[model samples]
Structures are given as C-alpha cells and as structure tokens.
Target: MLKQVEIFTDGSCLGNPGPGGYGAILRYRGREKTFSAGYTRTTNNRMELMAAIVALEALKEHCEVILSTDSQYVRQGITQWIHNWKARGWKTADKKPVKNVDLWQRLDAALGQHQIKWEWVKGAAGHPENERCDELARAAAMNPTLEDTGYQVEV
Candidate 1:
C-alpha cells in the first residue's frame, strides 16, 4: 500500500512580478518536513505552482497525497484547466497562449508519479499550517537568493 501524505503550500511576492517565494509542508504519520525557496523575480502564481511542484518532487517514492493550497489558481489550474490546456496544445479557449507554461509543465510531470487530491483552503484565515507556510513564503521572498530564469516580461 502506498504511504499517505498531506501537503500544505503557499506563495508570496514582494511585488506582482518582483521577488517571490514558495513554501510547503509535507506531513507523514507524525512527522513533518518543510520546504521553501525564493526567486529573484517572479509572480505569485508561479510561486504557487512551484510550491506544489517542489513538494511533490521532494518525495522519493509514490504516495497518496492530499495537497492543499490557498491559491485558486494552483488548485483549479492543476485539477481543472490543465487537462483542457494540454488537450488544446497549451492554449486557452480563445486560443491565447497559456501563461506559466514552464511551471505548469513541470508540475504536470511531477504529478504523474503520485495520486493527488487537490484541496483549496481560504488564505489568511488563521489555518495553522497555512499560516506557517505564508510566513515562510514571505520570509523567503524578502531574502530572495535565486534567479527566476523562466520569468519574462509580458508584452
């Protein structure tokens, strides 16, 4: 039987496309592991997707995962829109190219290795784990150490 894991994730940015960071906590049995990283330049949405991707990639083996995020973009994009986007060659209904294709593809690849249930939680509502993740994300954003190589200024 696969191990069961619960993950909580959040992201933050200093400015809409300025320094950004992501945080995640993975719980298994009675133990918890946390992860966070900052980027020199990125967006909140990208960080949100990165949080989930990083958490899943940290797992060494297949597991049943309940992944929670405060961002509707992360939860909804992965659970709902990803399929349609992939089917449509990464285009939206109006044939506009999808934003954050790089991170989305990376998240999709990480997703194939596990069984995940996506959960959307209310942000800044005093949920303990969520709050901790928010703190971590904000802290990381304030001390960004890595470049967001994929980020590009939209025209």
Candidate 2:
C-alpha cells in the first residue's frame, strides 16, 4: 500500500544560462518538508524537471505522488511526450535528438520507483505552495550553496 503524498515544485534561473535553482515541497501525513538546490550553470527547464526528479528521488518507499509544478514542460513532457520520445529512440517527432536526454533518462528511471500524478500549476496564479516554491527557487538561484561541473546551459 503506497502512501498518498503531494509535492509542489518550481525552478528559477537568473540568466537562462546562468545560476539556477530547483525548489520542492513534499507533504505527507499533514506535514510538509521543503528542499532546494542550486546549480552554478543550468537552464530553467532543467531545474524545473530537476525539481520533480529530486522530489521523487527522495522517496525511500513506493508512493502515490501527486506532483505539482508550475512548469508545463515537465508535466507535458512526462505525461505526453516521454512515451513518444522513448518509442522513437529518444528522438522528437521531428526526428531531432532530445536535448536533455541525460536528465530525462534519470527522471524516467526515477519514475519506476513510484506512481506519479503530474499536475501543472500555472506560475504566479496565487497557489501558495507553487508561489513558495518559486520563492525558494529564485532565492537559491541568487544565493546557491552548490555547483555542478557536468552542467552547461545550452539554452
């Protein structure tokens, strides 16, 4: 029996190709925990996807997760495009190679660990957790405590 949990996530970048951050809020059993991490050089989309990935990756047991994010990119990518991307050998419909294959593959593997329900929370639409996630992401982006030597923002 998987415990039902809710997660809110967001990401930010001071420069599209500069320092970036991902924020996540996990709620279970009426308690909430917040997590945030910064990358010295990355993309907003990467961080957005990373937020969900990090949140899910933290689970030590099977869970039924309602994952919410302000990023349609993450939601749509996971729900809609991932299947096609996998079927087409990780290529888009246009036959172009996927840009963030590394993170996407990580996310896909992480998916096997839980059953996720993805929701797109419009950014700045007055959702408290989403807004808080944005605040955390932006704050972390500006004042980061970490770096990733493997990431170079392509966008």
Candidate 3:
C-alpha cells in the first residue's frame, strides 16, 4: 500500500506578471516538510502550478496525495481541463493556445507518479496550513531570487 500524504500549496505574485513565489507543505503521519521558492518574473498561475509540481516531485516514492490549493485554476485545470487540452494539442476548445503551457506540462509530468486528490480551499479564509503557505509565498515573492526562464512578455 502506498503512503498517504497531505499537501497544501499556495502562490503569490507582486503583479500579474512580476515577481512571484510558491509554497508547499507536505505531511505524512504527523511529520511535515515545507518548501518555498521565488521567481524573478512569473505569473500567479505559473507559481501555483509550480507549487504542486515541486511538492509532488519531492516525494521519494509513489503515494496517494491529497493536494490542496486555493487556486481553482490549478484544481480545475488538472482535474478537468488537462485532458481536453491534451486532446486538442494544448489548445483550448476555442483554439486559443493555452497559457503557461510550460508549467502545465511540467505539472502533468509530476502527476504521473502519484495518485492525487485535488482539493480547493478558499484563500485567506483562515485555513491554517493554507494561511502558512500564503505567508511563505508572499514573503518569497517580496524577496525573489531566481529568474523565471519560461516567462515571456506577450506582444
């Protein structure tokens, strides 16, 4: 039987396409691990996706994951929209190219190794772990370090 794990994640951006960061907390049998990283330039959605990707990738073995995020975009995209997007060659139903395809693809790859239950929580609603993740994300965003190579300014 696989280990059961719980994860909480959040992302923050100083602006829609500016300094950004992601945070994740992983818990297993009362033990916990926390992670956070900052990007010099990125989007909130990208950071959100990155939070999930980074957390899952950090696991040493396959597990059943209850992954929680405040972003409906992450939960809905992974649970519902990813299949259609893949079937449509990463395009939307209306044929527009999907935004943040890079992070989405990375997230898809990370999902392959674990059984995940995606959960959505309301942001800033006083959920403890979610609040901690938000604090981490916001702090990292304010002191960004690494560059987001995948981000590009749309002309």
Candidate with maximal TM-score: 1
Predicted structure 3, TM vs. truth: 0.91
> Mind giving the per-residue lDDT tens digits that candidate 3 earns over 1-155?
99999999998898978999999999999999999999999988888888888999999898999988898779788778899878889977788778888889888988988898877888766689988998999999999998999887876
Give each model a TM-score: 0.92, 0.88, 0.91
Q: Which lDDT value does model 1 have at 94?
A: 88
- Model 3 clash pairs are none
Which residue runs does candidate 3 get wrong by more than 4 Å?
A: 92-97
Superposed model 2: Cα runs more than 4 Å off: 91-97, 153-155
Model 2 vs. true fold: TM: 0.88
The sequence of per-residue lDDT tens digits that candidate 1 reaches over residues 1-155 is 99999999999888878999999999999899999999999999989889988999999999999988888788788668999888999877788778888889999999999998877899767578988999999999999999998887877
Could you give candidate 2's per-residue lDDT for residues 16-64 as a string of tens digits?
Answer: 6889898999999999999998888888888988888888888889999
The CA lDDT at 12 in model 2 is 83
lDDT of 2: 0.85
lDDT score at residue 116, model 1, on the 0-100 scale: 89
Q: Give all candidates' CA lDDT scores.
A: 0.90, 0.85, 0.88
Please provide the root mean square deviation of candidate 1 (C-alpha atoms, Å): 1.7
